[PDB]
Design a protein around this ligand. Structure first.
Ligand code: Y01
Ligand code: Y01
Ligand code: Y01
Ligand code: Y01
Ligand code: Y01
Ligand code: Y01
Ligand code: Y01
Ligand code: Y01
Ligand code: I2U
Ligand code: I2U
Lengths: 691, 693
């Protein structure tokens, strides 16, 4: 049974009954600049994770699986680079570049062993919007893709520079702020953006490159205004590949019995399309938009153009943050599995270096794609050597084998990108779940979706995270303040309007604020305390001071005798600039009596009656205070003590006491003897003091 | 003494021992029929609230209020006429329209306002916001006397849009916007606006010409445009500005200190404006010297103009900032005078009144404004008992506009700027707050510093928006890394404190209490998991995976026929590939084995499992105020694997509403049962002890 026989403490008889322990900028500087040989070796190994895991290789049990997974992820990466390379309005030659240099750099500089870094559609569309904005903001057939590619390379370089700076500054906790509901809404909006943007390729039309605000609907108009100019054969083949891909995806997620190495319809039907393209000559018999001739070889590096460095400096921050968040989220699952310690700052540094290399070598920025990582992990990728195999596959397909991939319809790629989107868009079935879950996460999801579909894929994210930060204030703007009273005549206190056996001590009003008290709700806390208490202490003090002034005036006139309050037998309204004297503390030392303003009072003088001798502010749920809240609480406690009703604060810990000490909050009036351990011992001390 | 003899409760034997109450109605779908319930008394109350004039006009004590109100009205009227055509220079418009901004808002607020101690008009912060907005409008508009006309038209339109926004906000009853403006941010923004005033009045204190600049870095651009042409200043105008500045400051401080035997505050402002006008008319500053005298005042008002739609679209961003700053300044100024004299000011009514006043002023060729701090202070100090003083100020402005314009025409237009700089002493004194805040919170000081920097660089509207965003981020900053600790008993009673704080620290065997002194939401669930794992001492998922691997190897050996079950009689490394490792996270079931192996005492040969020392843990959630979907999911996963590794989990310090909220989260199921919540830490520990033995 629950039996306690301890004395009553007041947070100031406690420290004097139990001794404390030691509580000890130059402190951190010395321990941060302490150079050591072992520390240098550790930091070098961390900055170069390759040396950490290359020696610890179990070849005879890892090599075959890694090779198979590497070939699979390489074929998927070559299929995906020149598909995501179309969301950016650049030739698909450079898409393969974006899937090789980041992989090679991440081999050396990365920690995760189950991600295949490359381009993914969300970042590809971010880069496309950024490059369109750059080309539109730049002061003055084959004359457009050149500047598009140059601007894309520069924007990728700047995104990589931002990522590298963030990694160097060791601010890797940025991925914390994005959360889960916001990432789900942003993911759904980006999926819708993919669906809208791929229409211009699924229909084989020409669309002007729109930028930033209302990007989807502008593209929607530019696509739907020219339906009569589509190509029927291209639409038919894209449709047929779409339905067959969906059907086999269903038949693959189902029938998962005796089906090793699930059938890769992506590559299979891209091969089928390339074959029928070389066979029946869609370019001659029909009019299609086949991928252009692939030049054999890389391209010389180009210096990052400075003119577009300044123009896009806004969108590159969003690109870098989205890339880092996607990479961290994708690698989080594969680090939770297989139990290895992924490092966020190291991941940021690796991704930044990869983006610098890719942008310098005429590619575009990217990070590990969800589907590519999934296929790499499922195929048996034991480490990043699978990423190396994918990189060398991309290298050989760039250098030698390009003519077989040249006759690709360039719209089957768009439909394939639209293909793996069912699980990408299934998150739409979450508004209903979140409506009955929190009623705030659903709001944040809806606002995120609206902002990312109206403001665009860019500034929409910033507005979404700003609204996310505002949502915390929304949650704590109006705390459900209540009144507490005893239950069962023991040390249990609950809400007054919740139980039938409620018992309240005489003249004691317990107030609890179940939310942190900061700047945005100190006024609401004061109003709720006012309502729960039932009167305004400032009003009571003002009326008492007015009555005392009238009494003193009568005594000076010579109508009241002090021994009492015997009377032998003019409302003086006060002007401005002098009413402030009514807020002064009540002192009656000049009067020999001890009038309490409770029993009675001399003639024709009225003072509101009082029924409170104490109140207890429960601060168990209060987690922090700021300057505004401290000032408001000090004023509240000040006139509460001034109207001669004691105040007590309970449920606070030693660090909270220490923080409140350095606030100029304690003085001769608001003493430090007001803090108590629990509610019950405060009530007990209250009863002992009263009688 | 503290004596308690209650039974041990578990938040589920408590509800079954004490009956609850009704709680029979919701607050979302049934909230109607009380808001749309039309009633006669409700209609009278709402009409009285929407027209506060009828509330306090009948309740007038003339014989004790009229003389004081008249005196305060004359004083505030002379100050308002002195201030309108002074703040009218911050906007690049003729100072004739400045008097308009101090008359129509006052007249409208007379009818529509709740506060009885504010004199609504133009104030420098909003005047500069309107100036920046109108400069942006004139710069973004597609195509001597030809410039101020479009400037005035665009200023009137931007004022109209600000008033429309304020009226819409008041109608929507969102008057709680003002509480997103923490005192630290408001102080930083006030100081930055003071610096902006000081810089922007230089072009008039020096009598130069400066191109109108807009938004990003608008102080340093004006600083360059001013400092590039020092040689073009007028020495006489500079000399009179400096002498007036020093004397006004000196006598203002004399008024501050020598208040004893000082009947009525010193009229220095008006007295010296009169002196300057007199000497200007006398020595002919325009002829003998070259000055920038206020131009001739045309007698009469101006016909109303339609609000230009072309500039409606361009400035729609800056007008939100203008409206919010105006409403915040009005509410903050009236807050002091409502705390005094104890009357119930209504924020929505104030918003509606200010919006209507701004609409009228903008339609009648004025510019937006709200009650100025100094004007309100002088109106209150002079004895303003109600808004009839505001009416007297308004009629004073009317008569000075209509009749006496030639008297005020020969004003140097630089003494006005110096007077504007003179009062800036108290406004700029707030710079002595970074030091106070650095030793107070170390976060409010950061808010102040970032607010000042953002308002200096980004401008006024964009600076305020970015400052508010950073202020909102500061909450996450405060709760990003909670100071999580470990709790243990003190004195063998129901007192639990931090483990690293006392010498008599007693911890129960095999019980680890964890407390998170901050709300657990999306931005610290990972940190909470890391801290909990570190305090516990092991990874529960790692322990589960190793136990499952050992059990799989044991089952393989038993199938091969090497281990006998009856007790674990024995005789004499299969790495798992991907897409199948997920079987290691399954719950441990040994029903197929007759024994009850616990993975503590020992284990068959050549099989290693990490030892364990925890049989329960108590998560203190007294300080946890709220959870979201992400935190609920993370907590559910954590409790899931903790229960799966066969160590009980208990949560204490939570209230009935928190239990109710957590119930509708899909958080309780056959594994994470509802019997895990306890009242306090001590009864949880006691139940732990009773269950163990
Ligand atoms: C959910 C809400 C509160 C978020 C904020 C929404 C605004 C930022 C959006 C909604 C309407 C949008 C506008 C709708 C229409 C257009 C027209 C568009 O003009 C053109 O493309 C050319 C038109 C022409 O040449 O006639 C430029 C963007 C703009 C102003 C949009 C800019 C972004 C706006 C203001
Ligand atoms: C706020 C959310 C919930 C609703 C979003 C609706 C609007 C913000 C969208 C829907 C249709 C959009 C419009 C569709 C077509 C046009 C025309 C389009 O092209 C031109 O004006 C170019 C000239 C020409 O086409 O001849 C420019 C964008 C605009 C105004 C779009 C602006 C934004 C609009 C109004
Ligand atoms: C806190 C995070 C968001 C980073 C810090 C703020 C950046 C967003 C700022 C700080 C430095 C700024 C740069 C400082 C100097 C310049 C040169 C400046 O040169 C011009 O071209 C001037 C003419 C013009 O662009 O109007 C253009 C803006 C730019 C690139 C600025 C772009 C915005 C930057 C990167
Ligand atoms: C806030 C911290 C954690 C990250 C810091 C990274 C960025 C804020 C830096 C890194 C690279 C910088 C850019 C590098 C190069 C330039 C080009 C520079 O333009 C010129 O030199 C123009 C010369 C001319 O016009 O003659 C303007 C600044 C800018 C955009 C810089 C702006 C600031 C950037 C984006
Ligand atoms: C505390 C920090 C993180 C806040 C963010 C700072 C930026 C938003 C500021 C800092 C530097 C500023 C820039 C400094 C210089 C200029 C040049 C200025 O160009 C001109 O006025 C014309 C110059 C010419 O004609 O040569 C335009 C604004 C701009 C780009 C400024 C835009 C706003 C910037 C990027
Ligand atoms: C971030 C904080 C802590 C420091 C703020 C410093 C800069 C943001 C300021 C200081 C000086 C400013 C510059 C001072 C002078 C100029 C020239 C000025 O005029 C022109 O370029 C017009 C052409 C001409 O004057 O001939 C435009 C603004 C600019 C670039 C200013 C841009 C903003 C600057 C770099
Ligand atoms: C969010 C809630 C609480 C407040 C709503 C207030 C504003 C968002 C509204 C009120 C007045 C509106 C403005 C009223 C008039 C116009 C002019 C209008 O322009 C035209 O009609 C152009 C016609 C043409 O070009 O032929 C464009 C919208 C705009 C700026 C409106 C934009 C939306 C405003 C600012
Ligand atoms: C939540 C708060 C901040 C108010 C709601 C968002 C507003 C900031 C949005 C919603 C409606 C928007 C307006 C809707 C329609 C138009 C017409 C549009 O017409 C054009 O001139 C198109 C060409 C162009 O400006 O690029 C200009 C923007 C404007 C005024 C928008 C300005 C921004 C507004 C007021
Ligand atoms: N697994 C696999 O091989 N693939 C995919 O998942 C594709 C997608 O649709 C993606 C959407 C978001 C990331 S990938 C895809 C597209 C092409 Cl062109 C070729 C192969 C592809
Ligand atoms: N009290 C008073 O009479 N005055 C002031 O405080 C003036 C200011 O400088 C203000 C700065 C911010 C609000 S007012 C002022 C200016 C003039 Cl032109 C005439 C009188 C004035």
């Amino acid at each position: 049974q629950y039996i306690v026989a301890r004395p009553v403490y007041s947070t100031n008889a406690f420290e004097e009954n139990h001794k404390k322990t030691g509580r000890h900028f130059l402190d951190h500087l010395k321990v941060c600049c302490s150079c050591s040989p072992q520390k240098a070796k550790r930091i070098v190994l961390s900055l170069f994770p390759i040396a950490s895991w290359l020696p610890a290789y179990r070849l005879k049990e890892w090599l075959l699986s890694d090779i198979v997974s590497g070939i699979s992820t390489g074929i998927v990466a070559v299929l995906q680079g020149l598909a995501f390379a179309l969301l950016v309005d650049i030739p698909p030659v450079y898409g393969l570049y974006a899937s090789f240099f980041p992989a090679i750099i991440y081999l050396f500089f990365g920690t995760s062993r189950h991600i295949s870094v490359g381009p993914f559609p969300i970042l590809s569309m971010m880069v496309g919007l950024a490059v369109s904005g750059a080309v539109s903001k730049a002061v003055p057939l084959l004359d457009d893709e050149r500047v598009r590619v140059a601007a894309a390379a520069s924007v990728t370089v700047l995104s990589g520079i931002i990522q590298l700076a963030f990694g160097i500054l060791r601010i890797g906790f940025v991925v914390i702020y994005l959360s889960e509901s916001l990432i789900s809404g942003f993911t759904t909006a980006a999926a819708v953006h993919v669906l809208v943007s791929q229409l211009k390729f699924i229909f084989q039309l020409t669309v002007p490159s729109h930028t930033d605000p209302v990007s989807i609907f502008k593209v929607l108009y530019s696509v739907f205004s020219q339906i009569e100019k589509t190509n029927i054969a291209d639409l038919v083949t894209a449709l047929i590949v779409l339905l067959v891909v969906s059907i086999v995806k269903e038949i693959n997620q189902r029938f998962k019995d005796k089906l090793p190495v699930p059938i890769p319809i992506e590559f299979i039907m891209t091969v089928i399309a390339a074959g029928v393209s070389y066979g029946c000559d869609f370019k001659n018999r029909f009019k299609v938009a086949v991928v252009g001739d692939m030049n054999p070889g890389f391209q010389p590096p180009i210096t990052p153009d400075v003119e577009t460095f300044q123009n896009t400096v806004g969108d590159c921050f969003g690109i870098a943050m989205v890339a880092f968040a996607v990479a961290f989220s994708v690698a989080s699952v594969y680090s939770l599995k297989y139990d290895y310690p992924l490092d966020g700052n190291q991941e940021l540094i690796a991704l930044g270096l990869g983006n610098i290399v890719c942008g310098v070598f005429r590619g575009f920025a990217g990070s590990t794609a969800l589907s590519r990582s999934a296929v790499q992990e499922s195929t048996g990728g034991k480490t990043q050597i699978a990423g190396l195999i994918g990189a060398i596959i991309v290298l050989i397909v760039v250098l030698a084998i390009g003519f077989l991939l040249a006759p690709l319809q360039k719209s089957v790629l768009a439909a394939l990108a639209l293909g793996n989107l069912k699980g990408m868009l299934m998150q739409f079935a979450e508004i209903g779940r979140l409506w009955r879950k929190d009623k705030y996460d659903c709001l944040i999801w809806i606002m995120t979706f609206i902002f990312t579909i109206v403001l665009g894929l860019g500034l929409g994210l910033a507005a979404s995270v700003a609204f996310q930060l505002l949502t915390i204030v929304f949650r704590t703007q109006f705390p459900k303040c209540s009144t507490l009273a005893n239950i069962g005549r023991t040390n249990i206190y609950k809400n007054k309007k919740d139980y039938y056996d409620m018992y309240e001590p005489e003249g004691v009003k317990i107030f609890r604020c179940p939310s942190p008290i900061y700047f945005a709700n100190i006024g609401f806390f004061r109003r709720k305390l006012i309502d729960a208490v039932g009167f305004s202490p400032l009003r009571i003090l003002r009326k008492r001071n007015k009555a005392l002034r009238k009494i003193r005036k009568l005594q000076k006139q010579g109508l009241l005798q002090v021994t009492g309050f015997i009377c032998t037998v003019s409302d003086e309204e006060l002007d401005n600039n002098q009413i402030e004297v009514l807020d002064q503390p009540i002192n009656t030392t000049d009067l020999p009596f001890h009038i309490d303003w409770n029993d009675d009072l001399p003639l024709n003088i009225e003072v509101p009656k009082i029924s409170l001798h104490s109140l207890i502010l429960d601060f168990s749920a209060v987690s922090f205070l700021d300057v505004s809240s401290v000032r408001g609480l000090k004023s509240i406690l000040q006139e509460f003590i001034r109207i001669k009703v004691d105040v007590y604060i309970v449920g606070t810990d030693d660090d909270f006491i220490e923080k409140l000490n350095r606030y100029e909050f304690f003085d001769g009036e608001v003493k430090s003897s007001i803090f108590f351990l629990t509610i019950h011992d405060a009530v007990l001390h209250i009863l002992m003091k009263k009688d």
